[PDB]
Each structure stands twice: as structure tokens, then as C-alpha cells.
């Protein structure tokens, strides 16, 4: 269930390409792409929290994301995954998305904001699932053979693998400080602010209310929010606030790997004729098919080749 | 298949961070200096040295 996320929050992280060809900090930044399954299913870990509202209630139609210094809600219907072409999402929970994507060299994820602003993040990723069986097919057939494969399942609990969540680092914000006639405002807005600077006024410390320094210039001083109530995943893109992270909690990872059976096609029968100690066959593949043969004796002389078109083969 | 794990980096704005070794299957640790990291709201670290 989603009870484990009651004390957690969405977070922002750096994204190498925000869709404009330029990098920025983004609410939809990806953390990792996992492709352990052999059936081609992808498991994507993102900073977004899906199925959880900002009020910590459970709603499968909503996602929550980080917006500046506050959590915010958005429709789950606006969530998308894409590679070389639009990708189909098979299910979601928390930070994890299951989807079946078409082959491509890149992968991106995004959603529509509360202001109807699109957000996306793109990462390089080679997606090209392994071949199951001896034939290369693009879709499952009406009739065929069944072979073993690995997939992800919809189980959402007791997966035994967990992610650590820790109290976040100080969050800098240049918007907190402004310059009003020779003085600096601070403007806390409900969140405790730490401030300090190399100023002759030597005015530094914590505040819970607007504090006017009264001597220094806004371009001289730094400030950040330090008081946080909810913890976040200790992502590699977020600085540690201590040698060892504090307020440690744990979130289990949904969608474990499982043993399932995949359907594969069977190539149509060849046309066969015979000569003297010779077999001649015409192959009629629709898709690349492996042909191989061996002698049933001491020296098998094994040979194999791929055929992508009608071919005459003499053995 | 092996998995690579990278815990959040630790930043010490005004001093040198120290390193402890570990007995994990394949472990490395290094300290870098002269870093001046930024966040979405502006520079993270106050000290420029």
C-alpha cells in the first residue's frame, strides 16, 4: 500500500535535457532505468510520486510533484513516456513506472503541470530487447510456440528491496531576499530561513519571521530554507547534509521480477525437393529467421545463417 | 548482473571532507576540492574557498 509515503516528499533534481536542448533543474528528472526483464518491459524510476496527493491521501488518478518550496497536485492522465515513439504505460506506483516501449536510443518522461505547462526530461538509453527463440518478431502471433521469459508483476508490497529516505539539505532561494531602500527583506513566508554573509553588519542566524538586516545589500548575502518535515530519497543528484544522512526511513520498491512464459511465432513450411544425396529447399520468411544444421555423426560441421528474404538453400 | 550504487555526495563548504574505507565487494572513495555547486534556487554553498 501507500502508507509508507505519508512522511515522504517530491523533490527537484538536475536534468541534462529539459526538452529545449538545454539543461535545467526539473521536477520530472529521471533517476534510473531498469531493464532486467527479457520480455522488453522497462521499469523507470522518477522523482514524481504517482497515486499520492499532497494531502497524503490515496488517489490513483492524481500525481504529486515538487513546485519550488511546496508539493503540488496534477492529473495522472497527463503522464507520458516516450522513446522513438509513444510508449504504453502498464502501471504506476510512487516513484516507479512500468511501461512497454518501442526500440530507440533515447527515453523521456513528462507530465502536464497545474498551470498547463509541459515538463519533460530526456536521457540517453539504448532500448533493444533480446530475441526470444530463433525468430525475430515485432508482435505476438495468433498461434505459435511457448518459451520461458522474465517479466515484472503488479505486486506492490513485500518486495524486500528498499530505498533509503533522508532529511533534505538546505534549499537556497534568491527570491527570499529583496532590496528595499538600503535594507534587505528576508521574507520567510512560512518556512524557517537560515541566512549569513560576509557583511560588516555581521548579521546571521535563523528566522521564522521577516527580518530586515538594515545594513547590507541583497547582492551580498545568501539564504536558504532549513526546516523540513518530510524526507526524500537520497538521490545522487542531491547533496548530503551530513557524513551520514539523518531521519532515516525506508520505502519498498514495487513490481518485482517473475518467471513467465512468452508466445513466439513459427515460420511457415519450406518447399522441398530432392536430388542425389542433396536436399533443396525454398525458404519463405516474413521476418528474420535463423537456419542451422548439423551432421548426425562424429563431425557435425555445424553451420548457421540468418535469412531475411526468400532464399534457395542447397544442403 | 551487477548493480552500481551511488549514495548522495557530501558537501563541506568550509573545510575538507574525510574518507573511510569499506569492505564492500568493490568500493572507492575520493575527495574533490574547488567545487561550487548550484541548485534550482541559486548557489548552494556560501564559501567560495
Amino acid at each position, epitope marked *: 500500500n501507500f502508507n509508507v509515503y505519508k512522511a515522504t516528499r517530491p523533490y527537484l533534481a538536475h536534468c541534462p535535457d529539459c526538452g529545449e536542448g538545454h539543461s535545467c533543474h526539473s521536477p520530472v528528472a529521471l533517476e534510473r532505468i531498469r531493464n532486467e526483464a527479457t520480455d522488453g518491459t522497462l521499469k523507470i524510476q522518477v522523482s514524481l510520486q504517482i497515486g499520492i496527493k499532497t494531502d497524503d491521501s490515496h488517489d490513483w488518478t492524481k500525481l504529486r510533484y515538487m513546485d519550488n518550496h511546496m508539493p503540488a497536485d496534477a492529473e495522472r492522465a497527463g503522464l507520458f513516456v516516450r522513446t522513438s515513439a509513444p510508449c504504453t504505460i502498464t502501471g504506476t506506483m510512487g516513484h516507479f513506472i512500468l511501461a512497454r516501449c518501442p526500440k530507440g536510443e533515447t527515453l523521456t518522461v513528462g507530465f502536464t503541470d497545474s498551470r498547463k505547462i509541459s515538463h519533460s526530461c530526456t536521457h540517453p538509453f539504448h532500448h533493444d530487447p533480446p530475441v526470444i527463440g530463433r525468430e525475430k518478431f515485432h508482435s505476438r502471433p495468433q498461434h505459435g510456440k511457448e518459451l520461458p521469459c522474465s517479466t515484472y508483476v503488479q505486486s506492490t508490497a513485500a518486495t524486500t528491496e528498499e530505498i533509503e529516505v533522508h532529511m533534505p539539505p538546505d534549499t537556497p532561494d534568491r527570491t527570499l531576499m529583496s532590496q528595499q531602500s538600503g535594507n534587505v527583506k528576508i521574507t520567510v513566508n512560512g518556512q524557517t530561513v537560515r541566512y549569513k554573509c560576509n557583511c560588516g553588519g555581521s548579521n546571521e*542566524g535563523l528566522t521564522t519571521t521577516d527580518k530586515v538586516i538594515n545594513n547590507c545589500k541583497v547582492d551580498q548575502c545568501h539564504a536558504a530554507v532549513t526546516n523540513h518535515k518530510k524526507w526524500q530519497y537520497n538521490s545522487p543528484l542531491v547533496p548530503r547534509n551530513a557524513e551520514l544522512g539523518d531521519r532515516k526511513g525506508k520505502i519498498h520498491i514495487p513490481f518485482p521480477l517473475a518467471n513467465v512464459t512468452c508466445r513466439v511465432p513459427k515460420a511457415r513450411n519450406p518447399t522441398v525437393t530432392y536430388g542425389k544425396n542433396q536436399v533443396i529447399m525454398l525458404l519463405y520468411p516474413d521476418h528474420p529467421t535463423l537456419l542451422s544444421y548439423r551432421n548426425m555423426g562424429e563431425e557435425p560441421n555445424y553451420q548457421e545463417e540468418w535469412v531475411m528474404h526468400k532464399k534457395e538453400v542447397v544442403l | 548482473e551487477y548493480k552500481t550504487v551511488i549514495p548522495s555526495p557530501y558537501v563541506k563548504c568550509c573545510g575538507t571532507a574525510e574518507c573511510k574505507d569499506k569492505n564492500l565487494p568493490d568500493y572507492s572513495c575520493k575527495v574533490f576540492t574547488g567545487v561550487y555547486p548550484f541548485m534550482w534556487g541559486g548557489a548552494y554553498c556560501f564559501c567560495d574557498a
Partner: antibody
Amino acid sequence: EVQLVESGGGLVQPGRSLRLSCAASGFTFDDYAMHWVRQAPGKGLEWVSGISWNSGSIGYADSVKGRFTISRDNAKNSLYLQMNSLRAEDTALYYCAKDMGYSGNDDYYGMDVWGQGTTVTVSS
Amino acid sequence: DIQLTQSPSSLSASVGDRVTITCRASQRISSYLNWYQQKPGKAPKLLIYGAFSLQSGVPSRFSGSGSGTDFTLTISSLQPEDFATYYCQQSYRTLTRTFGQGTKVEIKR
């Protein structure tokens, strides 16, 4: 299950030395720095000495800087404090405490585990 | 040598009352201040560290706060079990940790 057990103490004459030690249990000794803290009757807590992991750094309070020596035995999971030339002013309860890291240079931490302090009395 | 300053003696409060204890340094020591709780006959226990993080096992009644250079410990509603002497501590980013004198809480009568 995590605890520190103090050993040693008792009555000693002025100018004489006394050895204190603590046994660690329930946690990995080599993952944390250790400190000694003492509390005289009617007084608050006073830090005495501390030792970093692998003895990378050694600190002492000014009042005992030239008189006390701190060491640790990782193989035995134990902490030691050697007090020389004890004075009447050194009478106090002596506690062992565990830090929250391997280094004492992290100011984000406090002392999370404390033992049961022993009594050291210095008098002729 | 930087000393810490706290309430001069003790506070008097009843059960359910709001209790505020403060600690400040004469000079800047660190960005964080820790709080400890001690009862007679017992070793001191860590209450808050990092000036914000509550130690595990500690009731939500206790919380960190502050203003300027003054660090604050707040008890939202004093309980019979919360009558203890509280101490402030700062490390100065070295082994030589510095402790305050402590503030005692007495029962109102």
C-alpha cells in the same frame, strides 16, 4: 541491545594515576568515534577527551591536556582513558559516550549513546 | 574559548503548559546546536541534533526552533515525564565539544 559499559574507578590519592575503560556491545565499534564526559556533583556535563576513528585525531580538554591520555582497542571493542597526576578537582562521575560518525569534524551530530558513569574520587 | 548562555536557573511550569528553553553562544561556534535531556541518577540522553532533527524514540512533543543566533528547545505540552534538566551543546567542528550549564524545570505550585 546497544550499550556502553563503564569499568574501573574508586578511591585514589592525589598525584596518583587511575585507569578507566568501557566495553562496547550491540554495535560496530569501528564505525564510530568515542568520547569521555564527566559530571561533578552539582555541576553540568563537562567534555574531557575524545578519539576519532583509527586515532586519526586526538582531542583533550585544556584542564587535562597534559595529564590525560586516550586510546582505543578495536580488536577488543573497548575504550580506555589513562588519568595521571589526579587532583581533587578531577572528582566526578565519568561516562563513556558514542558519537554518530567516524569523525569529530561533523557539527551536525550529538552524542546518541551513553553508558552508566563510574565514580572517581581523589582525596588524601 | 567560547561559552554558552542559557536561562539563569530554572523554569516553573504545570502539566499542559508551554515550555521554552533557549541557548546562545557569545561567539559563533557552529551552524547547529544539539539538545540533551537528563534526570537525576541517570545518564543524559540526546533529544535533538542538527538543531532540527528529533532523535528516534523521542516524543513529538519536543521540537527545535530558533531566532537569530539564539537556538530554542520547545515542549509543546509539558508532561509529568518531561521534568528534567536540559542541556545545549555545540561541537565547533572539532573533538572538543562544548556543553552549556543547563536549564531545570520545576513543578508549578
